[PDB]
């Protein structure tokens, strides 16, 4: 049925699955016109299609040309997302095709089901998880390839860099969701935590800095502190008085 804390461990089993997040497909700046009306200007977007086990990210760049002369763009965006996911599945060899696709937003269910009728054995599922994949465009190298695109493009990344050499996919996903949650809650503060030791760089072939195991623990702690600080600043709550149980709950929650 639905993906919850029912079992999170299903994400890291040997059944190929993808998350699909459509948050960044249709992106606009809202602006005043000369006559003082309001107009939107589309900017380049992306589909975020992620294997949570392997870290393989199929970033389909949505060029603004897709929208030209189309109506009801927020509706069309869901159908274009479903079209591109179905095209990706058909492009993969059978043994690489997912058994399940999990959409981060329930509005993607019917469009993806209708585009995948040819794949009756691929389960299309919602999730109860609040996943911070909208923050993907806070990763500088992903933002760069999207905004520079002059045409439709698929780019393949590993969103875990080389982490799976040292940690399990459960831990790698937990690190990824904590980083993205922090980038989503306070982007500038998250970037400062990630990039304020010039000695630790990002490899040309990576997305995130080259932290040692000990440094990842420190980074992870600073991210948790950021999310707790922002929860405090937001709700007018003294975060001094919070227990490890209280804190645990707020970050997961």
């Amino acid at each position: 049925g639905a993906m919850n804390s029912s079992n999170y461990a299903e994400l890291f089993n040997n059944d190929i699955k993808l998350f699909v997040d459509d948050t960044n497909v249709y992106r606009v700046t809202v602006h005043k016109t000369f006559e003082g009306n309001v107009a939107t200007k589309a900017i380049n977007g992306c589909i975020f299609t992620l294997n949570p086990k392997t870290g393989h990210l199929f970033l389909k760049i949505i060029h603004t040309s897709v929208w030209a002369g189309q109506k009801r763009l927020s509706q069309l965006a869901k159908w274009k997302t479903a079209e591109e996911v179905s095209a990706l599945v058909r492009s993969l060899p059978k043994e690489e095709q997912p058994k399940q696709i999990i959409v981060t937003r329930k509005a993607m269910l019917d469009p993806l089901e209708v585009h995948m009728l040819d794949f009756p054995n691929i389960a299309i599922r919602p999730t109860e998880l609040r996943l911070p994949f909208s923050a993907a465009m806070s990763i500088d190298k992903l933002s760069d390839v999207v905004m520079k695109a002059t045409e439709p493009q698929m780019v393949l990344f590993n969103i875990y860099d080389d982490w799976l050499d040292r940690i399990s996919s459960y831990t790698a996903f937990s690190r990824l969701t904590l980083l993205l949650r922090a980038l989503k809650t306070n982007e500038e503060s998250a970037k400062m935590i990630l990039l304020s030791d010039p000695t630790i760089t990002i490899k040309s072939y990576h997305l995130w800095p080259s932290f040692t195991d000990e440094q990842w623990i420190t980074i992870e702690s600073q991210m948790r502190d950021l999310i707790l600080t922002e929860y405090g600043r937001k709700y007018n709550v003294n975060i001094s008085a919070l227990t490890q149980t209280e804190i645990k709950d707020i970050i997961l929650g």
Binding site: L76, D110, E113, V114, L117
Partner: protein, 300 residues
Amino acid sequence: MNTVPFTSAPIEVTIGIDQYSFNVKENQPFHGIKDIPIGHVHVIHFQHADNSSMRYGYWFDCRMGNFYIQYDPKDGLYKMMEERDGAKFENIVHNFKERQMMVSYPKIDEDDTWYNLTEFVQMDKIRKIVRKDENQFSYVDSSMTTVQENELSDPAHSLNYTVINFKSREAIRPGHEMEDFLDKSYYLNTVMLQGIFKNSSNYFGELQFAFLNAMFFGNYGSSLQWHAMIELICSSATVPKHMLDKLDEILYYQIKTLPEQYSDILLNERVWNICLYSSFQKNSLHNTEKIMENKYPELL
């Protein structure tokens, strides 16, 4: 004016004929129904006083043979049978009429209600939905499942309604996913009207037959089929003017006839709200929207 005689009424039963009903006591000298209007299909239906789970009936057309009802004490139900001997049948009906042992089909002269519910319903189409080719009449009951219900068990005792599934390859052309899902015109006009039904009359006949099975037997699969056929039209941007005007008439009489006390089990909130207030046809069903708003405003 045709007659369906009864051998006897050995068990207490509520007997339905079309939209009419009357109570018969155990061993009451009831010997049938006379003055049945020629030109329409009819349904004779039963609910036993001692077991309301026994809800069942027979669709027939008196132009197609001489039919009677006889209680079967083994199978425990009123069965319809055909009498082949014209002269025996005429003689039985004459004796019962003379002894005034028959109820009269109680049609008011002004009243077009039954025509209005059965306008497109043909006995030959019923017999293709309800398959028992050795009989000219068709048995339906409250528990019979549809071919579509059996896909999601006994294939001989099923209602063979036309399968409608909005998320099926039949419904959606490759390359026209969004278009065909959001606007069901291709599915309605090419697949169903041109392809399967051949014309709107056969489509409405099945729609009307589904409603009547839903209302008279509480048949859940029939109710699903009635709503699916309404929703396929209401969800199509392109529908012939004549079909929308006729649909408005069909639905008006169905809603007019539905007992108020069954509206909560026979009417699907989602479909009716969508059809009347969100769909392409939201402004095309004037008569239906007015009766629904005046009779069932809570549902909406």
